[PDB]
Structures are given as structure tokens and as C-alpha cells.
Amino acid sequence: SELEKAMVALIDVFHQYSGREGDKHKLKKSELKELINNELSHFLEEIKEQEVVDKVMETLDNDGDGECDFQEFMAFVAMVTTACHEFFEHE
Amino acid sequence: SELEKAMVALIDVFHQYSGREGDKHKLKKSELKELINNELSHFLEEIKEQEVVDKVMETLDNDGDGECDFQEFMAFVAMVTTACHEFFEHE
């Protein structure tokens, strides 16, 4: 159930937010901002993501005029956590 | 920690598999097959995914000659669960 609880969480947390129907039945990336603020991994401001989060906030706001998909939900939270190569900094 | 445990699981389960270093430090999609067989949501063979899983097995095998990224880890598990539009079948 390790990955099971992972996939469910990504979708169910999206369900919780107030754009699940009203927006595009999905949310603009500007709303994803507030989401990653908390439910990413609490904070994370001290490792490396501190750079990427800021760069994300730029791209998030600019690009996400259309919508943010669950594919990008993963993208943003994974890229702030990585953004270098891949698993080089973690495995 | 709802989404926190989600992101950690996606990466750490990948870490567990025997291609985390030996393959491309990532795994061919062919290995992702075995991964989704179990750690997707146990099984799921009766809702709608039963179609997509097969279509996935085709594409997975054909396209994943290079590698499978964590981005695609999400992609495949999310698409088998969806593949229609977006959250239409779930929210």
C-alpha cells in the first residue's frame, strides 16, 4: 500500500481544494502554490528546493493561466525536490 | 503529511527496486511493469484500468527502451487510473 497511499493522496488532496469543480474542475497553478506551501513536505526551505520553489513560483504563475493537472502536481513537487539531474541528490 | 508521504513513497519505492543504480540509475519501463502490478493499488482489474493497463503494457514495453523516469512513474499509474479526460470518473 506504499505507492497505493501515494497515488490516492495526490488525487484526494486535489479533491479537497476549492477548485476541484469551480475552476476547470482542476486548479490554476496559482492555487497549486498554496498547496505546495504546505502539502509538499511541510516546508522544505533549507535543502535545495529553496531555489526551485522560487523559480517554480515564477513559472507556476506565468504558465499556469490555463490549468494545473495532476501530472503537473507531481511535476512541481518532484522538481522542487530534485531539479538537477534526477536521483543524484537522493536516490 | 498527506502529500508528503505520497511524494516520499514514489521516490523511495523506486529506490527499493533493483535498477536504482544498476540500470540507468533508473529503470526501464519494463521493470515499472512489475512495479505497477503490485504497488499501484494492489491490483485494480475491475473498474476501467483493466483496459489501460494492457495499453500501458504495450507502450511501456515499446517506448521504455531508454528509461522510465519518476515523472513517468506518476504518468503510468495516474493514466491507468484515469485515461478519459481527467477527474471525470473520480474527482
Swiss-Prot record, chains A, B:
Zn(2+) binds at H15, H25, H85, H90. The keyword Nucleotide-binding does not apply. One of its GO terms (biological process) is cell adhesion. Disulfide bonds: none annotated. SUPFAM superfamilies: EF-hand (SSF47473). GO terms for cellular component: ciliary basal body; cilium; cytoplasm; cytosol; extracellular region; extracellular space; intracellular membrane-bounded organelle; microtubule cytoskeleton. This is Protein S100-B. It comes from the Eukaryota. It comes from Homo sapiens (Human). Keywords: Acetylation, Calcium, Cell adhesion, Cytoplasm, Metal-binding, Nucleus, Repeat, Secreted, Zinc. Ca(2+) 2 binds at D61, D63, D65, E67, E72. The gene is S100B. The modification Blocked amino end (Ser) is found at S1. GO terms for molecular function: calcium ion binding; calcium-dependent protein binding; identical protein binding; protein homodimerization activity; RAGE receptor binding; S100 protein binding; tau protein binding; zinc ion binding.
